[PDB]
Amino acid sequence: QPFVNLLSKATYWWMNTLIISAHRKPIDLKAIGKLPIAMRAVTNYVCLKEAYEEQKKKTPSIWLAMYRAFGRPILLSSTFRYLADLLGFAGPLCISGIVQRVNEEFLENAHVLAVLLFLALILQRTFLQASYYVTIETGINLRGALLAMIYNKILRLSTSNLSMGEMTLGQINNLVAIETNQLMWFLFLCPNLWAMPVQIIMGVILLYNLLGSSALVGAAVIVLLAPIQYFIATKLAEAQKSTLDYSTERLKKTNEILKGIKLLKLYAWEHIFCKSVEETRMKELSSLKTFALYTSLSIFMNAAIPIAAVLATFVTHAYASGNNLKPAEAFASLSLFHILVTPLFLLSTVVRFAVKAIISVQKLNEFLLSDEIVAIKVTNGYFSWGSGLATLSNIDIRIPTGQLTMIVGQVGCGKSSLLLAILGEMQTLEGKVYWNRYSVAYAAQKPWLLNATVEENITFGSSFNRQRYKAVTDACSLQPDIDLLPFGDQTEIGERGINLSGGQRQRICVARALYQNTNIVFLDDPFSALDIHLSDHLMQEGILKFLQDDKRTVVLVTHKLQYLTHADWIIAMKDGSVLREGTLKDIQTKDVELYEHWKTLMNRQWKTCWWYLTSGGFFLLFLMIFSKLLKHSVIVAIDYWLATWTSEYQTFYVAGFSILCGAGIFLCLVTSLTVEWMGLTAAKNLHHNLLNKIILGPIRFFDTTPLGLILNRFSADTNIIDQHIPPTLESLTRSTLLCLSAIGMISYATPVFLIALAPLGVAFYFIQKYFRVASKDLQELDDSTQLPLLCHFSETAEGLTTIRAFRHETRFKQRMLELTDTNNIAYLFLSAANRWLEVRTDYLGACIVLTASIASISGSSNSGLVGLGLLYALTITNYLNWVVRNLADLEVQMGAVKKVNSFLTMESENYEGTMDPSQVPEHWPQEGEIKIHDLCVRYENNLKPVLKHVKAYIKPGQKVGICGRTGSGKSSLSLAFFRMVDIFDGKIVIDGIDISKLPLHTLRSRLSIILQDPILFSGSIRFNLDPECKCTDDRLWEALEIAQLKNMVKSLPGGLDATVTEGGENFSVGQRQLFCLARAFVRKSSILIMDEATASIDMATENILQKVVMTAFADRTVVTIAHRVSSIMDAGLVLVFSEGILVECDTGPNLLQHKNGLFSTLVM
Ligand SMILES: CCOc1cc(CC(=O)N[C@@H](CC(C)C)c2ccccc2N2CCCCC2)ccc1C(=O)O
Ligand SMILES: Nc1ncnc2c1ncn2[C@@H]1O[C@H](COP(=O)(O)OP(=O)(O)OP(=O)(O)O)[C@@H](O)[C@H]1O
Ligand SMILES: Nc1ncnc2c1ncn2[C@@H]1O[C@H](COP(=O)(O)OP(=O)(O)O)[C@@H](O)[C@H]1O
Ligand SMILES: [Mg+2]
Ligand SMILES: [Mg+2]
Known part of the structure; x- marks a missing residue:
């Protein structure tokens, strides 16, 4: 049993x-x-x-x-x-x-x-x-x-x-x-290091016994295959390593287009900015060509050498040895080369992986050596972030049990340092930390969010309690922002989740600490990027009402001393040293200066498979399949030719044998190159079109489609097509022909064998049919589970x-x-x-071998032929597997092409304009007049017009103001000028031309808009001034000084051509808004659309914008959508839009003069 x-x-x-x-x-x-x-x-x-x-x-x-x-x-x-x-x-x-x-x-x-x-x-x-x-x-x-x-x-x-x-x-x-x-x-591949070399030694040992001194000559050539394969292997690595290098930053450029895609489209240089990717794309292919050639060469040396090995052996033995070749000797030896070809060919892979493993283990062993680490009573604290220098000195603090122990200090002053020291995140060179360690519900100063739901983020492994969840959501005011989220509390957030704003991100983590039921909290400056009202709202309920009910200790490091009165304790620290410890009553009496000084600052306010092949062109597809047939035709004839030659048991047979191997070697070169030459051409055309379609794609698509999925087409799916399909497609064609031909040749030698084929074909089909669907589905699981594992490791690294x-x-x-x-x-x-x-x-x-063995015995053909059939019987068993496994690999990889093809045909925005280009003269928007005729504006095909029956004449050079209710038709109207949202009804006429009846790219180019948060793309400032580069250099300097940034720029290295981080990282948020103004002037738009311009802008910087707009663009018409409605008080023309209706339309003062309308209540 x-x-x-x-x-x-x-x-x-x-x-x-x-x-x-x-x-x-x-x-x-x-x-x-x-x-x-x-x-x-x-x-x-x-x-x-x-x-x-x-x-x-x-x-x-x-x-x-x-x-x-x-x-x-x-x-x-x-x-x-x-x-x-x-x-x-x-x-x-x-x-x-x-x-x-x-x-x-x-x-x-x-x-x-x-x-x-x-x-x-x-x-x-x-x-x-x-x-x-x-x-x-x-x-x-x-x-x-x-x-x-x-x-x-x-x-x-x-x-x-x-x-x-x-x-x-x-x-x-x-x-x-x-x-x-x-x-x-x-x-x-670990056994092979001592498995294959043993086989190679034995294989040559048998060869000499089979033939004699001849086989060594053939064995010597075959041995040389392995050194060749390693030299080719190294060149592949450098070719691929460079290829990845171009690909890595090509994705980075791809991400910039895909993120903030609307911004590029508004300025009309979506086409031009795309071509910057193509420049790197060609370099990516220029690495592939060197890779593709060497991969083809590796295929060539895998086939040209063994055929040159046999040609070197049999020719030798025909002269060195008096005895003529016997059929048994030929096909015993000739089989052995096929036994030795694989270990010699793949031996370069196992040794190379041995080199890579020794590289990684050394890398991984370096990793492990990386540095590893009265509620709270600490006396004489000395903490250092390494470097042998105490970053905190004279530290002595007391945190009373179950009380709000707030900490106050200036910029730096050991602000975040003091908390982390208690948490063991830094070395305490002296003193002692007494949790008088309980779980501490610390909040990260920076925003770190998991790739999961908000509810999971607030619960963080805690049993749900909606009533407890209720107070936390109310106390932290998470309830309103949640309504905006797609899946509510089941909205996945973080890098993989929805992209939030800084203020909302902070409150989520703070809520977590309130959720966790522990006696101790460490709230680190939650109001870093928050409105004062919410922080005041939190200080009343969340800080006091929620926590005092739990009676837990809180240590809230704060910079506004107006809430110190609420604090049950105050901790003053500066220069990494505690200024004084004591309550507001104790501090004011003991340290009179501290009371006034803080108050002073406080006072300061598979049809795809055929589709894929045809991509190159019919000739390239024809040449590959035509030649590969010919290569096997010569190869098979060579195996047959030995049967004619060995049946004798001699310069005729040798002569015809050399030329055949000559064509076989040459045809190996041709069939090696044609497959790859298809691959690159198939690779280029597929990706080349794809980027165009995404760029022309509708904006609504990007809003619907997650950013992670779109980039996956260019990251993984394009990688599969470029590098994986041509190898698999090569091996499938090579393996199929060998299996098709060998079964043919065996059958031709022994026609009786065809009777035995009927069951075997059935069995092979069922294994081919069933395994393909079982391997494809398991393949999906392997990729599906691998990705979250990497996400978890990155998530745990951040914010340990x-x-x-x-x-x-x-x-x-x-x-x-x-x-x-x-x-x-x-x-x-x-x-x-x-x-x-x-x-x-x-x-x-x-079974094929057994049938071929038995059938051949019964057959009385030439002794060579019966040997030949047995030779192919042994070869079949080797390759009859790869015809299935490669086919499964091909089937999965055809999934990527199917996804790409869909994107290619999915959608486009109509860039063509019906009216002739001659209709628009030079400087069309020069007049600046805006005319709106009964407009109706809704982006979604079936939805209410976000703007409805809009009409308000705009004089040229009028600083028109548009405002209303939050979320009620204000910004949608902005894109309506840019036609990004379809004007289903009505029309907009600018300077006597309807904006609908004009080419799309013309409309976007000749206007100037400024979003709420400006974004600066990677490259020079000149790149961010005119990606089109048409504008002359003189004007580029003028804009920065006009934007008041030229003086700042001159300090930067490279002068005007100064490198800028992607996403405007180098420039401050206030500085970022200055960059847009520079772009605004160069266009000569005569129309400015400042939608939420002052939003997310400091008041000090805001004054510059008002100074710039009134001065720099005085002739221009500025359609401002102010964050603070008070700025529209002096607007000569003011529109109020509520529920997509022009509820109020008059001068600013006239709005208060006519009646206490929506604007009057809006300001007051
Ligand atoms: C575990 C994943 O990988 C394997 C790994 C093994 C163990 C193994 O020494 N193979 C030999 C093949 C035989 C012909 C020697 C080998 C050696 C060197 C390089 C690649 C390979 N092979 C592995 C990668 C695909 C190409 C041939 C078996 C089978 C597999 C497999 O496919 O499942
Ligand atoms: N994790 C850390 N590793 C190394 N140095 C650190 C670390 N945290 C703080 N420091 C250093 O300790 C000093 C004081 O930092 P501190 O805790 O006061 O920051 P902070 O005022 O909270 O910071 P910020 O307001 O800029 O976020 C600085 O020199 C800072 O660079
Ligand atoms: N991507 C979107 N899909 C569907 N509806 C949206 C989208 N973005 C905004 N909305 C809705 O359309 C309205 C647009 O408001 P808008 O006039 O753009 O002013 P604001 O941008 O200040 O909200 C909002 O009230 C919002 O509820
Ligand atoms: Mg800090
Ligand atoms: Mg808005």
């Missing part, structure tokens, strides 16, 4: 059910059983950690610890691998014996030898496939522990700027994605302070251990499913 269990483990019958289930229902984690504790990340991490700690007892070596953990399984796998190679060598020996016994006793009989071959091949591949699976179990178990192990370091890292920085996040994000995968892949603060370590560790477990299963059952296919094609493959 236990033989049944051994067999079932040996042929992966256990996977079979799942495979069949894939047809009935998609395979999913529910359908896949839970991973055994023998392979869960917990046990693997414990084993590896125990080995590593024993090593640390003996710096410890990662390599030796990994061996001590995972040695026995790879020893077993290598034993299986040897037993597989030795039985694989039965192939040539059995073929030689058969051919000798045929053509005229227990072992000599061909039948007994034929059956022996059938048992050998079955046993060879049962062993060989099992040997692969053991390493995969070992390899995955290794990746299981490492991801757990390096994660333990992340929670124990230190956030000091010295030990952690922007460079640090590069390693950890890359270590999980790359360093471990390279280390895992090495383990998959909170994780250490809340004592959320263990819960977060558990999340990772389960997250990786869901990922290993997907990859493990992807490899086990793939193994199931390989076993059941060899069990099928052995």
Whole structure:
């Protein structure tokens, strides 16, 4: 009975059910059983950690610890691998014996030898496939522990700027994605280092015995394949490494277009800004050409050399040896080269991965050495962010139990430092910290949000309590902003989630601390980017009413001393030293100056598959498929030619043999180049069009579509097409022809074999049909679960302070251990499913050999031909698997092309204008007059007009003001000028021309608009002044001085051509608004649209805008939508829009004069 269990483990019958289930229902984690504790990340991490700690007892070596953990399984796998190679060598020996016994006793009989071959091949591949699976179990178990192990370091890292920085996040994000995968892949290929070289030595050893001194000449050439393959391998790495480099920043430029896409389209240089991506795109391809050529060359040397090896052998033996070639010798030896081609060709891969693994392990072992770390009573505190210099000195604070212990100080002054020191985030060189450590609900000063729901973010692993959630939402005033969110409390936020504003981001985290039921809180300047009212609102209810009900301690570091009276305690610290400790009563009496000085500052106020091929052009598609037929035609004839030559058992046969191999070598070059030459042309045309369609795409699409999904087309899907399809498409065509031809050639040698084909074809089709859908679905799971694992590691890296603060370590560790477990299963059952296919094609493959062996014995053909059929029988079993696995890989990759093709045909905005271009003369908007005729404006095809029946004549040069109710038709009207929102009815006429009846790009260009938050794109300031570059350089300097920025610019390096960070990082927010004004003047628009211009702008900077607008654009007409409606008091023409209706339309003073209308209530 236990033989049944051994067999079932040996042929992966256990996977079979799942495979069949894939047809009935998609395979999913529910359908896949839970991973055994023998392979869960917990046990693997414990084993590896125990080995590593024993090593640390003996710096410890990662390599030796990994061996001590995972040695026995790879020893077993290598034993299986040897037993597989030795039985694989039965192939040539059995073929030689058969051919000798045929053509005229227990072992000599061909039948007994034929059956022996059938048992050998079955046993060879049962062993060989099992040997692969053991390493995969070992390899995955290794990746299981490492991801757990390096994660333990992340929670124990230190956030000091010295030990952690922007460079640090590069390693950890890359270590999980790359360093471990390279280390895992090495383990998959670990046996080969001592398996393939043993086979190579044996293969040559047999060759000499088969032929004589001739085979060495052929063996010598074949040996040279491996050094060639390594030299080609290195050149691929440099070609690919450069290729990734251009691709990496090409995505960065892609992100800039896709984020803030409206901004580019408004200024009409969406086309021009796109071409900046094409410039890098051509360089990306210029790396690919060097890569594609070398990949084709690697294919060439994989085929041209063995054919040159045989040509070197048989020609040699025809002269060095008096004996004419015998049929048994030829096809025994000729088979052996096919046995040796794969290990010689792939040996460059295993050694290269050995180099990569040793690179990563050294990289990963450097990682581990990275630096690792009265409610609150601290006396004589001395804290330092490393650097051997106490960043905090003379620290002595007391935080009374269950009271608001607020801290006051100036810029710097150890503001955030004091809190983190209590949390163990920095070294305390002296003193002692007494939590008189409980869980501390610290709030990060910076905004760090998980890629999950707001409710999860506020609960943060706490049991839901809507009444407790109610007060938190009310006290932190999270209720109103929630209504705006798509899925409410189930709105996923963060980098993966919806992009928020700074003020709303801060309140979410603060709410978390109130949610957590702990005696201690550390609220770090929540009002950093908040309105004063909400902070006052929080100080009344959230700070006092909510917390005092819980009677928990609060330590709120504050900069406005107006709330110190509310504070039960005040802590004054400056220069990293505590100025004085005491309440407001104690501080004023003891430190009279502090009371006045603070108050002084307080006073201060598969049809796609065919579609993909045709992309290059019919000739390129024809040439590839036409030539590949010819290559096999010559190759097969070469194998046949030996049958004609060896049937003799001699300058004729050799002569015809050299030329054939000459064409075979040459045709190998042609069929190698044509496939890749298709790939680049197929790669270029697909991506080239795609960027155009997105740019012309409607703005409404970008609002609907998540930003993560759109960029995925250019990041992953385009990567698949460019680099993965041409390799797979090459191997599929090569493997199919070999399988199609070999079955043909065997059948031609033994026509009786065709009767035996009827069942075998049926069996192959069912395995081909069923596995494809089972591998495709598992493939989706492997990618699906891999991505959140990387997201978790990046999320835990950022803001470890909170994780250490809340004592959320263990819960977060558990999340990772389960997250990786869901990922290993997907990859493990992807490899086990793939193994199931390989076993059941060899069990099928052995049947082809067995039928070919038995049929050939019965046939009385030429002794060479019966040998030839057996040769292809052995080759079939090798390639009959890759015709399925590559096809599955091709089918999945055709998914990317299907997605791209949809985007290509999905949508466009109508850039063409019906009226002739001659209609618009030079400087059309010069007049500046605006005319609105019964306008109706709604972006969504079926929706109410956001602007309805709008009509208000605008005089030329009139600083018209438009305002109303918050969220009631104010900004929509702005884009209505820019036609971004379709004017379903009515019309807008500017200077006697309806804006609808004009080319779209003309309308966008000749206008000037300023959004609420200006954004500056990567490049020079000249790039941000005129991407079109048409404007002469003289004007560019004028605008900055007009914008009052030229003086600031001159200090910057490079003068006018000064590099600018993407997104306006270099310039301050106030400075950012200055950049737009520079763009405003150059256009000579005569129309300015300042929608929410003063919004998100400091009052000091705001005065400049009013100074600039009244002066710089006096002749221009400024249609202002003010953040503060008071600025429209002096507007000569003022429009009020409520519910999409012109509720008030008169002069500013006349608005108060006519009646206490909407504007009058708006201001007052
Ligand atoms: C675990 C993922 O990877 C594997 C890994 C293995 C273990 C393994 O030494 N393979 C040999 C193949 C045989 C022909 C030697 C090999 C060696 C060097 C380079 C690649 C490969 N192979 C692996 C990558 C695909 C190309 C051939 C088996 C099977 C697989 C697999 O596909 O599932
Ligand atoms: N995590 C850290 N790593 C290294 N240096 C730090 C760290 N936190 C603070 N410092 C340094 O300690 C000093 C005082 O920082 P402090 O805690 O007062 O900041 P802050 O006033 O809260 O900051 P900000 O208001 O700019 O956000 C500064 O020199 C600062 O660079
Ligand atoms: N992307 C969107 N999709 C659907 N409706 C929106 C979208 N953005 C805004 N709205 C709604 O349309 C109105 C537009 O208001 P608007 O006139 O643009 O002034 P503001 O921009 O100051 O809200 C808002 O009340 C809002 O509720
Ligand atoms: Mg700070
Ligand atoms: Mg608005």
